[PDB]
Amino acid sequence: GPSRVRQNFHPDSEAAINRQINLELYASYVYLSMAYYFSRDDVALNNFSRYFLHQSREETEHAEKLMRLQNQRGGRIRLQDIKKPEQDDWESGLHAMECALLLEKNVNQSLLELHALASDKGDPHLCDFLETYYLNEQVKSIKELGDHVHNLVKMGAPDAGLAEYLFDTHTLG
Amino acid sequence: GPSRVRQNFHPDSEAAINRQINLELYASYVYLSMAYYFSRDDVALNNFSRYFLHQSREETEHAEKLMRLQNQRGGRIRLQDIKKPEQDDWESGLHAMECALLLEKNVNQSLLELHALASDKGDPHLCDFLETYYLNEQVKSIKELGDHVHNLVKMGAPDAGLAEYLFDTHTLG
Amino acid sequence: GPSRVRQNFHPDSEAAINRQINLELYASYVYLSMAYYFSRDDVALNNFSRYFLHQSREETEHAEKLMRLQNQRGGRIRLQDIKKPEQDDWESGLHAMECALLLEKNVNQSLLELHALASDKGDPHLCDFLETYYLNEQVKSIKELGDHVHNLVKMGAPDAGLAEYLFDTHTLG
Amino acid sequence: GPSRVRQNFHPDSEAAINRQINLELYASYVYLSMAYYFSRDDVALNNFSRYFLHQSREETEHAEKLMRLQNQRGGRIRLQDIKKPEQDDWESGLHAMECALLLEKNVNQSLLELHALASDKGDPHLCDFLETYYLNEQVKSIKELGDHVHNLVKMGAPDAGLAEYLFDTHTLG
Amino acid sequence: GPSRVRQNFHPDSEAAINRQINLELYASYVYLSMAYYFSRDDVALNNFSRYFLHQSREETEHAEKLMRLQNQRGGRIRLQDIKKPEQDDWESGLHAMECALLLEKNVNQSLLELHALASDKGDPHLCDFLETYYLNEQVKSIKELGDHVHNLVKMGAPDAGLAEYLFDTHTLG
Amino acid sequence: GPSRVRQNFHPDSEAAINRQINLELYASYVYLSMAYYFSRDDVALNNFSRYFLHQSREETEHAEKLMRLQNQRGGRIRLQDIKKPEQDDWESGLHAMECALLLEKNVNQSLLELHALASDKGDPHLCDFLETYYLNEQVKSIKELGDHVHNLVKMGAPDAGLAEYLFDTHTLG
Ligand SMILES: [Cl-]
Ligand SMILES: [Cl-]
Ligand SMILES: [Cl-]
Ligand SMILES: [Cl-]
Ligand SMILES: [Cl-]
Ligand SMILES: [Cl-]
Ligand SMILES: [Cl-]
Ligand SMILES: [Cl-]
Ligand SMILES: [Cl-]
Ligand SMILES: [Cl-]
Ligand SMILES: [Cl-]
Ligand SMILES: [Cl-]
Ligand SMILES: [Cl-]
Ligand SMILES: [Cl-]
Ligand SMILES: [Cl-]
Ligand SMILES: [Cl-]
Ligand SMILES: [Cl-]
Ligand SMILES: [Cl-]
Ligand SMILES: [Cl-]
Ligand SMILES: [Cl-]
Ligand SMILES: [Cl-]
Ligand SMILES: [Cl-]
Ligand SMILES: [Cl-]
Ligand SMILES: [Cl-]
Ligand SMILES: [Cl-]
Ligand SMILES: [Cl-]
Ligand SMILES: [Cl-]
Ligand SMILES: [Cl-]
Ligand SMILES: [Cl-]
Ligand SMILES: [Cl-]
Ligand SMILES: [Cl-]
Ligand SMILES: [Cl-]
Ligand SMILES: [Cl-]
Ligand SMILES: [Fe+2]
Ligand SMILES: [Fe+2]
Ligand SMILES: [Fe+2]
Ligand SMILES: [Fe+2]
Ligand SMILES: [Fe+2]
Ligand SMILES: [Fe+2]
Ligand SMILES: [Fe+2]
Ligand SMILES: [Fe+2]
Ligand SMILES: [Fe+2]
Ligand SMILES: [Fe+2]
Ligand SMILES: [Fe+2]
Ligand SMILES: [Fe+2]
Ligand SMILES: [Fe+2]
Ligand SMILES: [Fe+2]
Ligand SMILES: [Fe+2]
Ligand SMILES: [Fe+2]
Ligand SMILES: [Fe+2]
Ligand SMILES: [Fe+2]
Ligand SMILES: [Fe+2]
Ligand SMILES: [Fe+2]
Ligand SMILES: [Fe+2]
Ligand SMILES: [Fe+2]
Ligand SMILES: [Fe+2]
Ligand SMILES: [Fe+2]
Ligand SMILES: [Fe+2]
Ligand SMILES: [Fe+2]
Ligand SMILES: [Fe+2]
Ligand SMILES: [Fe+2]
Ligand SMILES: [Fe+2]
Ligand SMILES: [Fe+2]
Ligand SMILES: [Fe+2]
Ligand SMILES: [Fe+2]
Ligand SMILES: [Fe+2]
Ligand SMILES: [Fe+2]
Ligand SMILES: [Fe+2]
Ligand SMILES: [Fe+2]
Ligand SMILES: [Fe+2]
Ligand SMILES: [Fe+2]
Ligand SMILES: [Fe+2]
Ligand SMILES: [Fe+2]
Ligand SMILES: [Fe+2]
Ligand SMILES: [Fe+2]
Ligand SMILES: [Fe+2]
Ligand SMILES: [Fe+2]
Ligand SMILES: [Fe+2]
Ligand SMILES: [Fe+2]
Ligand SMILES: [Fe+2]
Ligand SMILES: [Fe+2]
Ligand SMILES: [Fe+2]
Ligand SMILES: [Mg+2]
Ligand SMILES: [Mg+2]
Ligand SMILES: [Mg+2]
Ligand SMILES: [Mg+2]
Ligand SMILES: [Mg+2]
Ligand SMILES: [Mg+2]
Ligand SMILES: [Mg+2]
Ligand SMILES: [Mg+2]
Ligand SMILES: [Mg+2]
Ligand SMILES: [Mg+2]
Ligand SMILES: [Mg+2]
Ligand SMILES: [Mg+2]
Ligand SMILES: [Mg+2]
Ligand SMILES: [Mg+2]
Ligand SMILES: [Mg+2]
Ligand SMILES: [Mg+2]
Ligand SMILES: [Mg+2]
Ligand SMILES: [Mg+2]
């Protein structure tokens, strides 16, 4: 138009926010896939299921806050296909945790690149938005997943018969 | 394996449930797109936004109940890409309502075909599942959208300046 | 003295904060003028009046937080005349909303320049202060005013006899 | 128009009310300046600060009641620049109290002149308004400031090191 | 390893965080020393004691939040000796306040250098951490100590017999 | 002076109390180090972390009660550097427990020597202070750590993958 609200909002930032929306929705879909893997009759780790379902819902929240930001700043949301996850069968509780850790690091890297772009374009509102709602959340998530991976490895997952069962009930319970 | 739980569950039913999961997730994405269209600064119909956001969340619930059914019956969830909606700019409150009505009829037709398949395969559990949780929900949704379309048309949407504003505040408020 | 508290606080930042204080007080005065325009017997839109009176009080808060910052950092407040608003008769609810939107964008631009100055002077405390309390508040205010302008335009304000009356009662009520 | 509400309201009264509005806003600004003087790190008398901030807010109330009166009687508010206070550095708690006393007497004199004008123009509504809301308030304010000045003088302010500190905590606390 | 959680975290930042941990623990020890100075039988200013004990506990909190950050980011905490304070006998309430002010400015300078390092290394998570939890806290602490120093100087501390006694009971009480 | 409060308080006792203060602060620092070892991403035993953090806070309390005693008896606190712990990486939950047990025995021995000194100097107040607040606390702490070491050894820590995990959740939880 430009939008009557738009101010100090670079087209490159608008496009990068659209890409980030897609990535957050993708992460939501990965965790939804994991949640329902753990409720298979031949897996049946209900607290792993609940843990990943919660993570899925959080990622949808992350996508929505970026969609709201786009509108607030006068950009236009452009949605793209949400790609299916890389797997349907996630192999084990440990493997799912390791894949989640890799996913979160990848999302973090994208957010850091978005922050660098916002800095380059002199957009302190966008920088603050990412710092306030995204960057520390990512650090906490990565740390949590790292803790979980360590405990599962030490306990002898996936092959030690009691490991994932006991972690399911005592850590994720 | 087959799954140690699987009984009277035809592979064609399992595949059709996977297709229905994708369609429910697609419908969820369409309504999410609509929700954020109505919160654009140049649209700003907050109760249309809230209405479609609620519909989006309901469709995710519909997808999840089918995913649970797949696990309950011993089938294996196979996720596919969630296609982007046909539009980002939904034009008006009336146009969004008309598109939602068409979407719901299309989803209904898919559910009726799923029911016919389940009947052909002598799967009364699957027939009952669809009747109990899907078919009446669809009829109620289609009727509601039909009511909304009629009122918006009669009020003179989209061109009559007061129509969508007043419908937003008095029907969807 | 310098102040026994002063540290990493550039004289240019101190002066720019004094200018921003004046601009926030000016904005408060503009909105006070608008508030009392809407309570004229020949205007009588009481919820427009209340809306702008609230905005006026918020701007005084914005001025006071900067005055507090000046003291906290060891700068010295230097007040200047508060210029009268550009108009006493604000013409219509739509015109007042459009003028408020322009005012908020102008204040935003001043805040962005203040942030750039603070960045240039390596003052992260001042940068954070602006990000935490000012920049997102401005984005939200501009978006809100944009929403209001759009609805009033679409409804046919100012000439459509029902438009401002109905917006007063249903949006600002 | 004249206003369809206007009755027995002389143009000279309308103009004098506009002048009084400006004077009340000026007094509000003087007291805001004083409030933030007392929160300087090299002054730090927090109850003097709170006392003057309260007085500032009361003066804005006084301005608003006159603005409301203008509208009630069918006059038209005409705002003018709010002049900056005569000082930024108010020297001491005693000096600020003495300046406040002088300010209140000056405002009182203006109100008495307004009352004499209203009497001359046979406007008993305006006379009653001033008597009901302004004249006794002024007498109480002047008396309070006189009490405070006397105690601070007797205690040995500003040079006696304990005087303003102890008055801050025990009278204004 | 590197740590499986580590991302965008420069070794220089990790080392600087270890140095800051030591400095916060040092500040905690200085304030603990001051707290117990004021409870000597020949000093006996119990509210000065309580004030510095509270400051001591806050500094331990500051150290712990940095230790947590180190773990969150995948760095490794490296503790060093906590040096004893420069004095055991802090001379007077005024002298302790002046020493605390100098200490807080020194800690602030270290935090500003840490922020500049984090900026140089493109670590927005670390920048935000310092802005959110440290930089404004320091500004508030320095301002508070400046206020206290001013009042004690004006009251005639340390030699005026009533000054520290009255400040203890009325400001710190 | 001597202190006007000092009575039956030998200079050797005063010096020994200063040494004990340092040792209690050292023990506090050892346990703080252990607490944050257990929250590393590659250790992640949160109840070991909480257990040692609590022990750290208790040791600071032990130091403060001796500092208070020094003042109560008219002695003068003389603080010294707090040496860093012997390790940053505490190897395992069992190793940390074994090191804590050794530390507590060492502190106990110092307290017994202090008691023998107080007895030699005919200071029954000091003897009672140590008996009332220190000696039984030490016996309880040593016994608790001995219990924990035994269970961890029997369970097969540190190499048995489930041992420290299960002890963390069921004993320290
Ligand atoms: Cl722009
Ligand atoms: Cl795509
Ligand atoms: Cl920037
Ligand atoms: Cl864990
Ligand atoms: Cl590991
Ligand atoms: Cl167990
Ligand atoms: Cl079957
Ligand atoms: Cl596809
Ligand atoms: Cl059947
Ligand atoms: Cl309807
Ligand atoms: Cl129709
Ligand atoms: Cl209506
Ligand atoms: Cl400076
Ligand atoms: Cl000017
Ligand atoms: Cl900076
Ligand atoms: Cl609106
Ligand atoms: Cl528009
Ligand atoms: Cl008249
Ligand atoms: Cl003027
Ligand atoms: Cl009269
Ligand atoms: Cl008085
Ligand atoms: Cl007098
Ligand atoms: Cl007193
Ligand atoms: Cl790294
Ligand atoms: Cl050292
Ligand atoms: Cl950065
Ligand atoms: Cl103070
Ligand atoms: Cl001073
Ligand atoms: Cl003695
Ligand atoms: Cl030493
Ligand atoms: Cl004895
Ligand atoms: Cl035990
Ligand atoms: Cl044993
Ligand atoms: Fe999470
Ligand atoms: Fe959550
Ligand atoms: Fe996310
Ligand atoms: Fe694909
Ligand atoms: Fe794997
Ligand atoms: Fe995530
Ligand atoms: Fe920044
Ligand atoms: Fe921030
Ligand atoms: Fe997360
Ligand atoms: Fe619905
Ligand atoms: Fe619903
Ligand atoms: Fe559906
Ligand atoms: Fe496509
Ligand atoms: Fe259409
Ligand atoms: Fe539907
Ligand atoms: Fe529905
Ligand atoms: Fe209505
Ligand atoms: Fe506002
Ligand atoms: Fe507000
Ligand atoms: Fe503002
Ligand atoms: Fe002018
Ligand atoms: Fe206009
Ligand atoms: Fe504003
Ligand atoms: Fe605002
Ligand atoms: Fe007053
Ligand atoms: Fe009052
Ligand atoms: Fe007044
Ligand atoms: Fe002037
Ligand atoms: Fe004076
Ligand atoms: Fe007054
Ligand atoms: Fe008054
Ligand atoms: Fe007193
Ligand atoms: Fe503090
Ligand atoms: Fe505190
Ligand atoms: Fe600190
Ligand atoms: Fe030394
Ligand atoms: Fe000194
Ligand atoms: Fe500090
Ligand atoms: Fe502090
Ligand atoms: Fe203990
Ligand atoms: Fe305890
Ligand atoms: Fe101890
Ligand atoms: Fe050493
Ligand atoms: Fe060992
Ligand atoms: Fe101990
Ligand atoms: Fe004894
Ligand atoms: Fe005893
Ligand atoms: Fe203990
Ligand atoms: Fe258990
Ligand atoms: Mg326009
Ligand atoms: Mg992508
Ligand atoms: Mg479940
Ligand atoms: Mg079998
Ligand atoms: Mg399909
Ligand atoms: Mg909304
Ligand atoms: Mg000095
Ligand atoms: Mg200006
Ligand atoms: Mg009103
Ligand atoms: Mg007429
Ligand atoms: Mg005047
Ligand atoms: Mg104050
Ligand atoms: Mg690995
Ligand atoms: Mg150092
Ligand atoms: Mg005490
Ligand atoms: Mg004597
Ligand atoms: Mg020693
Ligand atoms: Mg913990």
Curated annotation (Swiss-Prot), chains A, B, C, D, E, F:
A Gene Ontology cellular-component term: nucleus
Signal sequence extent: none
Domain (Ferritin-like diiron) ranges: 7-156
EC number: 1.16.3.1
Record key words, sorted: Iron, Iron storage, Metal-binding, Mitochondrion, Oxidoreductase, Transit peptide
Tissue expression summary: Detected in testis and erythroleukemia. Expression is very low or not detectable in brain, colon, heart, kidney, liver, lung, muscle, placental, spleen and small intestine.
UniProt record similarity statement: Belongs to the ferritin family.
Shown chain mapped onto the complete sequence: 64 to 236 of 242
Quaternary data: Homooligomer of 24 subunits. The functional molecule is roughly spherical and contains a central cavity into which the polymeric mineral iron core is deposited.
Highest taxon listed in the record's lineage: Eukaryota
Summary of the function given for this chain in its UniProt record: Catalyzes the oxidation of ferrous iron(II) to ferric iron(III) and stores iron in a soluble, non-toxic, readily available form. Important for iron homeostasis. Iron is taken up in the ferrous form and deposited as ferric hydroxides after oxidation.
Keyword flag Iron: yes
Swiss-Prot/TrEMBL catalytic activity: 4 Fe(2+) + O2 + 4 H(+) = 4 Fe(3+) + 2 H2O
Biological process annotations from GO: intracellular iron ion homeostasis; iron ion transport; protein maturation
Subcellular location: Mitochondrion
Binding site for Fe cation 2: E59, E104, Q138
Protein name as annotated: Ferritin, mitochondrial
